[PDB]
Amino acid sequence: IKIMKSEVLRVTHELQAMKDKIKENSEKIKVNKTLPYLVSNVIELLDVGKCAVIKTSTRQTYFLPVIGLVDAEKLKPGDLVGVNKDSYLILETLPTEYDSRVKAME
Amino acid sequence: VDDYTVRVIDVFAMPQSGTGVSVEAVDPVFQAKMLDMLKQTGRPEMVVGWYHSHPGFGCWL
Amino acid sequence: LGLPTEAYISVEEVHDDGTPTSKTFEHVTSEIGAEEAEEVGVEHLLRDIKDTTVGTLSQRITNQV
Amino acid sequence: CTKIINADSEDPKYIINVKQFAKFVVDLSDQVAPTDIEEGMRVGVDRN
Amino acid sequence: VPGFLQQSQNSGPGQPAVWHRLEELYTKKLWHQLTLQVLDFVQDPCFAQGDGLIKLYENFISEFEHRVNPLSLVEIILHVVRQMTDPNVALTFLEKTREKVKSSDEAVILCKTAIGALKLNIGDLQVTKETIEDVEEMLNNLPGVTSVHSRFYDLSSKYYQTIGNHASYYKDALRFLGCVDIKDLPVSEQQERAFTLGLAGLLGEGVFNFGELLMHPVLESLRNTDRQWLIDTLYAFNSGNVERFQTLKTAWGQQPDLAANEAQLLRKIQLLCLMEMTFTRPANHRQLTFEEIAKSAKITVNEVELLVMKALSVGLVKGSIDEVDKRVHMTWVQPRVLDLQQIKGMKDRLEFWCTDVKSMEMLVEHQAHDILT
Amino acid sequence: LLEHKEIDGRLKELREQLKELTKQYEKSENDLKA
Amino acid sequence: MVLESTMVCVDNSEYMRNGDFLPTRLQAQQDAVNIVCHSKTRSNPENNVGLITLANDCEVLTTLTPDTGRILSKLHTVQPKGKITFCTGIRVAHLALKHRQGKNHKMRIIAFVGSPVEDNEKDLVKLAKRLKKEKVNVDIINFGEEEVNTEKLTAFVNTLNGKDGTGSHLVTVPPGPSLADALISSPILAG
């Protein structure tokens, strides 16, 4: 019973510490995922556990062993994403622009 | 050492920041704790200057 | 001649099958290896009359000695 | 400039097309207000 | 509690001083002094048949301490359960204690090995082996206690009434001898232990030479008093001399445990003998004619091949046999203890080869001084 | 059973319910290696 | 008031297994270091505190640091499963006191011994001399065993307080009421 209370105090101190650790982690995530992302057209997703090849708007193809800082389930092969300008990883997904006639038709 | 000599005894890196390589990229707190704590280690050397890598751009400012 | 470093690791055995307790750091084979953009710094720090990676007959006989 | 990404002052980024160069999502400068920026207009953007 | 302590101050050797010390330590609520006092008290020479009141006393003491190291508390419990001498109630008491002290330290471990030791007489296999593997698998980050290993000897050694536990029993018995550094046991007890150890070494199927058996202090120090025939057998087997008359002398000097395994003992001594002939000739003439092995190992030349094959199979030598010319080639990787005079001789051999190395180094250096630069 | 009603009254939420922050830490570590 | 780096010497030995204080002598040491470090930190905000184990080895779990929460948590789960050693403990305390960060900090440690020290008076007195040469001013408090303020400890005090020197007070704690007020009446007023 007393060991239980000691474990309770230990776990609450661990909670307090890992709070600030996850905050530092988030700060450095925002340090990497700042704002001036580059949009890329995701050509397709390949299995490896998924890796994606993308065609960034700088007419350049790129293979990503890890799919950035976004979930990886929907991720349609053509879903426009904001890939990092220098390290080329997917910081965020943005809604699809248009599909030729589907915008040519209101 | 003198007006004709600068002796870079050592260098310590700095955390990568989203700004890039600027004067806001030097964390005053990180710089401090590193300075006092290296002084404790046995490296009580004043900060001579800074360095940054221009990858493939050559050497210039 | 041959002693740049020696790396040791502690193991959990008393001393042998039939001996009292000890710890007895274990030697591990050590190599001095560098990746790119570190080995080049070594070379630039070097480039005295030393090096000559290609093995001339003179250098090979010196190696045998 | 293109779609406002549905900014609402928490997503001030917009996908912008610099001619034959690429397209980028970018946030505003402090000297400009979002009310002065809407889709489809030419906007001067910094290098850094 | 003081009522029984003062009333039952008697019924114990040297009762007044010790029980008044117990009184004064109890009224002052000292426990570690109390725990050392009680371990000394239960380690007294006696039968301590007053089990009921002593178990009640330790019941109060253990319920009230709740922080005394479970090593000492479990030592007291071990002595008291040795005192009760009744299997089922002792088992239930051990369960109650291990549920009273569930600390991660060496309390449940000693409870399990005490269960195994008490259950060795009934149900040798079905419960003790799993406790053994449990103890060894969660023996970690406390190697310094060095008593659970003595109890491990107790369990896996009193398991030697088998054929397999003659080399494995020897293994954990040497491990135990390492476990108890100080001798601190009666000469008769260590003599019995070295008796069964020599038995293990001789009847060990996988143990052939296995030095450090003669060089372990526990046997060499105190086995020269009585039953020296076994130590003589150890000498002769490590020396490889069959010594038929003296080996038989020990055979009918110790009729049991050696007449019924004489075949495997002969196998072992013959392999050791071949080891010695390989030792004697320093590869100057490696090819040994079958006459040497026949006369030396006292075997027929039809059986040298068989014993060589056996020695290769077990893993001690890695030679080969030339039957055409009646020779055997030997390239073997089995070393031995090395007899300090032999240390000096091998030192001289090292000196010879090192000065040869040095001489050729100077020769090449002088001849190539033009090129070395 | 004095202070052992269900589990110390507190460990039920601290052990796993408030340990979901370790799952979020795992997510953070995936963000790291990405 | 004065800048200092405290190096507390907590005992988790097996001779600590005493009932001299009501709940637990080890817990008596835990809340005693708790209260004394509370008083010291509250006395001077920038002071540094640390922890040393003396059982079968000198574990230095927390060194000279200003924060009190983490040393406090190190007090818990101390697991008293060892054997005390005063001399090596005070040696480690002294060398840590040499390795303090701020040079102005006047050296100071808090030592709590509740076990009978098994040693020889000659080594003890020579160690008192060595600590006297380095002007390391200790306070020593006798807990636990009935040989409170043993001749070893009195010699330590009168030698470290050589002709009323550093101020290693022989504050006496009864083998009974090691009460918090009994542990704060003397030191918070003086040492």
Side-chain angles (χ1 to χ4, degrees):
Chain A
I1 319 276
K2 276 55 150 184
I3 288 174
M4 291 215 318
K5 179 162 55 200
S6 313
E7 201 276 306
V8 157
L9 77 91
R10 180 272 292 261
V11 78
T12 197
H13 310 317
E14 166 269 341
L15 200 59
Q16 311 147 26
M18 151 195 87
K19 282 179 191 97
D20 61 83
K21 317 192 311 173
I22 203 138
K23 301 323 293 188
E24 306 318 282
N25 259 229
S26 85
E27 298 299 16
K28 88 144 185 48
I29 279 303
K30 304 330 308 173
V31 152
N32 178 302
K33 179 188 169 53
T34 47
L35 81 173
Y37 316 157
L38 164 64
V39 50
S40 175
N41 173 37
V42 177
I43 294 325
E44 59 204 8
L45 273 35
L46 280 53
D47 266 313
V48 75
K50 197 83 63 187
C51 312
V53 317
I54 76 186
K55 170 94 145 55
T56 178
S57 46
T58 89
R59 294 213 170 281
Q60 277 263 31
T61 54
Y62 274 92
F63 177 85
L64 290 72
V66 280
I67 318 304
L69 299 199
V70 66
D71 49 61
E73 67 284 17
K74 327 153 285 317
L75 269 295
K76 253 270 280 179
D79 191 345
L80 260 64
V81 317
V83 63
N84 167 269
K85 158 169 143 172
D86 264 8
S87 36
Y88 290 63
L89 66 158
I90 307 197
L91 295 317
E92 85 130 17
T93 308
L94 47 78
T96 166
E97 190 41 53
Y98 97 112
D99 189 82
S100 42
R101 181 68 150 197
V102 320
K103 172 211 167 191
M105 170 200 289
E106 62 97 2
Chain B
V1 174
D2 54 44
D3 292 87
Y4 314 80
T5 282
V6 163
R7 185 163 300 185
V8 177
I9 287 288
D10 247 12
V11 61
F12 71 86
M14 262 210 158
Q16 165 75 34
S17 300
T19 289
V21 294
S22 163
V23 60
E24 34 272 53
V26 302
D27 171 12
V29 202
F30 188 100
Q31 192 252 13
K33 48 177 95 73
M34 195 63 99
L35 259 179
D36 318 68
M37 181 203 328
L38 262 292
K39 146 59 192 172
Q40 195 292 324
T41 301
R43 182 49 48 68
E45 261 70 1
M46 190 169 29
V47 77
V48 154
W50 69 292
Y51 86 99
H52 71 302
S53 51
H54 279 333
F57 316 159
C59 304
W60 42 272
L61 271 35
Chain C
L1 77 172
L3 60 172
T5 189
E6 280 297 17
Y8 293 138
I9 176 165
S10 172
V11 285
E12 188 177 17
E13 169 65 20
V14 278
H15 200 235
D16 187 7
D17 52 355
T19 37
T21 285
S22 287
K23 308 300 279 282
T24 321
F25 278 118
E26 187 31 76
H27 184 205
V28 284
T29 41
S30 309
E31 214 43 51
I32 308 299
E35 78 272 45
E36 182 70 342
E38 181 204 18
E39 152 198 308
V40 57
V42 167
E43 180 76 11
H44 186 87
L45 275 185
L46 296 196
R47 173 38 68 202
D48 296 350
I49 208 69
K50 325 156 185 187
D51 314 65
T52 320
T53 166
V54 82
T56 170
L57 197 50
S58 184
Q59 193 44 290
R60 304 201 71 51
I61 305 303
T62 290
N63 190 14
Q64 316 272 315
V65 163
Chain D
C1 175
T2 332
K3 80 156 64 173
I4 312 304
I5 193 58
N6 192 334
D8 318 351
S9 174
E10 83 274 327
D11 325 305
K13 76 209 65 191
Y14 326 118
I15 56 192
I16 86 158
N17 193 341
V18 282
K19 195 82 201 293
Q20 306 155 236
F21 202 16
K23 299 160 309 152
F24 309 81
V25 325
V26 302
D27 166 283
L28 290 305
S29 312
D30 72 323
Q31 318 317 354
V32 312
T35 55
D36 317 286
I37 307 299
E38 322 76 32
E39 100 293 344
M41 61 152 108
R42 151 185 324 136
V43 282
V45 316
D46 73 302
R47 269 68 188 279
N48 222 31
Chain E
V1 191
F4 334 105
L5 199 179
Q6 272 274 72
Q7 167 224 313
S8 57
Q9 68 184 358
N10 209 269
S11 73
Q15 74 98 335
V18 296
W19 279 70
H20 305 349
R21 183 156 65 259
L22 285 141
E23 299 157 25
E24 59 167 300
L25 63 71
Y26 175 51
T27 190
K28 290 169 171 297
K29 310 228 305 186
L30 298 197
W31 332 288
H32 191 236
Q33 316 82 340
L34 150 74
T35 56
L36 83 85
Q37 197 38 67
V38 61
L39 51 62
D40 165 37
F41 175 74
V42 305
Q43 280 317 89
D44 72 328
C46 167
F47 218 44
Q49 265 283 15
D51 200 316
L53 203 31
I54 68 188
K55 68 212 316 172
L56 294 194
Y57 186 33
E58 56 95 354
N59 167 28
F60 310 117
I61 296 307
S62 178
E63 207 277 311
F64 161 69
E65 51 175 63
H66 279 185
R67 56 172 292 232
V68 156
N69 82 54
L71 163 136
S72 65
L73 158 75
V74 151
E75 291 227 348
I76 309 147
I77 294 318
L78 199 174
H79 307 126
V80 85
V81 299
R82 185 51 278 154
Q83 168 53 223
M84 323 146 46
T85 79
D86 164 20
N88 286 34
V89 78
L91 255 47
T92 319
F93 197 26
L94 257 76
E95 316 285 352
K96 291 186 297 278
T97 41
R98 67 166 291 194
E99 298 286 44
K100 168 171 291 298
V101 53
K102 314 152 281 303
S103 306
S104 311
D105 58 340
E106 207 181 86
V108 314
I109 296 97
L110 307 203
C111 156
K112 292 160 128 60
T113 180
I115 281 171
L118 175 59
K119 277 182 146 301
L120 72 84
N121 33 55
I122 48 193
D124 73 321
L125 164 140
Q126 72 288 284
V127 60
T128 87
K129 307 320 151 200
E130 52 90 15
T131 53
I132 278 170
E133 64 81 21
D134 200 350
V135 159
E136 71 80 31
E137 72 96 19
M138 34 72 91
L139 170 146
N140 48 330
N141 329 295
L142 70 172
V145 203
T146 325
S147 34
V148 47
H149 187 206
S150 306
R151 325 306 156 193
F152 187 43
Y153 170 108
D154 283 287
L155 327 170
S156 301
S157 68
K158 303 324 272 186
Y159 195 72
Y160 37 55
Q161 63 300 346
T162 70
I163 287 290
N165 232 3
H166 275 327
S168 147
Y169 157 58
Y170 176 84
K171 151 260 291 182
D172 66 303
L174 271 201
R175 285 151 176 249
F176 169 53
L177 291 169
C179 155
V180 304
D181 43 317
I182 171 184
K183 310 327 291 153
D184 78 272
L185 276 311
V187 161
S188 299
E189 193 275 339
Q190 318 214 355
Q191 269 214 140
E192 157 265 349
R193 194 279 321 151
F195 193 28
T196 166
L197 254 297
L199 289 196
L202 296 169
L203 329 170
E205 47 267 61
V207 164
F208 282 83
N209 169 86
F210 261 51
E212 181 228 15
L213 180 51
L214 307 92
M215 313 327 167
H216 210 315
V218 64
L219 319 89
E220 194 265 317
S221 311
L222 52 90
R223 281 320 302 291
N224 317 338
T225 73
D226 191 18
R227 313 186 273 198
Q228 190 79 324
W229 39 267
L230 197 141
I231 320 306
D232 274 350
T233 66
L234 260 300
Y235 303 170
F237 266 52
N238 265 238
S239 97
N241 173 26
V242 168
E243 49 148 47
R244 322 100 53 182
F245 96 96
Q246 169 168 325
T247 319
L248 228 44
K249 167 266 286 190
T250 77
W252 41 263
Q254 184 223 349
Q255 293 74 340
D257 309 271
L258 156 67
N261 319 110
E262 185 255 341
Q264 33 164 325
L265 265 306
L266 218 33
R267 203 65 149 175
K268 193 170 315 191
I269 179 55
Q270 285 162 338
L271 164 154
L272 266 297
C273 184
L274 72 73
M275 282 265 188
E276 274 85 45
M277 61 214 57
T278 53
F279 171 92
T280 290
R281 193 101 63 51
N284 191 4
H285 331 108
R286 168 42 39 204
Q287 299 301 93
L288 59 143
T289 295
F290 290 166
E291 59 157 331
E292 301 180 73
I293 179 80
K295 303 341 309 170
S296 76
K298 302 152 193 174
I299 40 160
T300 65
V301 306
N302 235 19
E303 312 299 324
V304 46
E305 41 153 19
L306 286 312
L307 43 82
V308 171
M309 290 280 322
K310 171 58 58 73
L312 317 167
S313 59
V314 50
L316 269 42
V317 297
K318 334 169 304 313
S320 295
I321 307 105
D322 175 289
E323 217 288 331
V324 184
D325 311 349
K326 287 181 108 207
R327 336 196 81 74
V328 169
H329 333 76
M330 201 36 48
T331 87
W332 102 100
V333 283
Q334 203 74 10
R336 37 159 52 79
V337 308
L338 218 47
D339 308 66
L340 282 285
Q341 203 285 334
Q342 293 176 341
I343 298 314
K344 266 289 201 59
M346 105 185 312
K347 263 167 70 167
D348 217 352
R349 261 196 50 219
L350 191 161
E351 185 88 79
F352 280 155
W353 162 61
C354 84
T355 179
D356 259 359
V357 165
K358 166 75 84 186
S359 91
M360 195 49 100
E361 164 201 351
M362 331 295 308
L363 182 140
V364 55
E365 208 150 34
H366 170 42
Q367 294 288 348
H369 192 37
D370 316 351
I371 311 174
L372 264 283
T373 327
Chain F
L1 77 165
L2 330 169
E3 209 44 49
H4 201 77
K5 328 165 202 162
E6 57 283 76
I7 179 71
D8 219 322
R10 324 277 305 206
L11 197 40
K12 44 192 189 62
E13 55 101 336
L14 269 157
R15 195 199 308 105
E16 185 43 63
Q17 160 182 329
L18 254 297
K19 212 50 63 192
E20 69 89 22
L21 215 61
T22 41
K23 154 170 282 261
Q24 313 313 350
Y25 217 79
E26 144 190 344
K27 152 77 181 176
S28 187
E29 295 311 309
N30 319 127
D31 310 319
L32 258 291
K33 48 185 147 288
Chain G
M1 38 287 290
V2 312
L3 265 303
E4 74 90 27
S5 296
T6 277
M7 164 32 43
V8 154
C9 291
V10 155
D11 193 12
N12 77 303
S13 65
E14 195 58 29
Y15 274 31
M16 180 30 36
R17 184 52 31 61
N18 292 335
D20 320 328
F21 193 67
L22 322 92
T24 283
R25 214 45 163 172
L26 172 88
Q27 205 284 333
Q29 176 158 201
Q30 307 200 25
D31 58 9
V33 293
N34 166 39
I35 59 190
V36 300
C37 77
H38 276 354
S39 80
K40 163 64 88 194
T41 288
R42 92 173 74 260
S43 66
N44 195 31
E46 330 92 355
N47 281 353
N48 333 111
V49 315
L51 176 162
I52 256 278
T53 277
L54 294 87
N56 75 91
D57 163 68
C58 319
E59 182 39 81
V60 48
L61 270 186
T62 282
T63 171
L64 324 191
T65 76
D67 185 282
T68 171
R70 30 163 180 136
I71 167 158
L72 271 189
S73 33
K74 302 322 221 163
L75 321 177
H76 322 77
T77 72
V78 85
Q79 299 322 128
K81 159 69 172 205
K83 322 146 43 155
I84 200 192
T85 311
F86 184 90
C87 67
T88 71
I90 173 65
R91 287 303 262 293
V92 180
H94 166 48
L95 120 156
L97 267 189
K98 306 312 292 298
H99 263 240
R100 40 120 183 90
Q101 285 60 22
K103 75 97 170 183
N104 170 50
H105 285 217
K106 222 46 178 180
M107 42 289 315
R108 220 61 204 79
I109 69 167
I110 300 316
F112 272 150
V113 43
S115 163
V117 286
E118 48 277 56
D119 275 285
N120 170 29
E121 194 68 88
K122 190 219 107 63
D123 326 291
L124 277 280
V125 70
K126 83 153 72 69
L127 198 35
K129 308 310 151 201
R130 197 158 288 115
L131 308 168
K132 191 164 162 281
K133 301 137 179 152
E134 264 72 6
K135 324 311 179 192
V136 168
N137 95 94
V138 153
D139 78 322
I140 189 45
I141 302 120
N142 191 290
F143 265 40
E145 58 111 28
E146 296 318 272
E147 196 192 348
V148 288
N149 330 110
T150 187
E151 71 295 0
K152 299 179 138 301
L153 166 47
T154 81
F156 248 56
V157 163
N158 312 136
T159 45
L160 272 204
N161 297 3
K163 47 75 174 175
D164 182 18
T166 37
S168 301
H169 331 294
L170 260 203
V171 67
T172 88
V173 198
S178 199
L179 174 91
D181 212 4
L183 298 172
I184 68 171
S185 49
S186 83
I188 84 183
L189 280 64

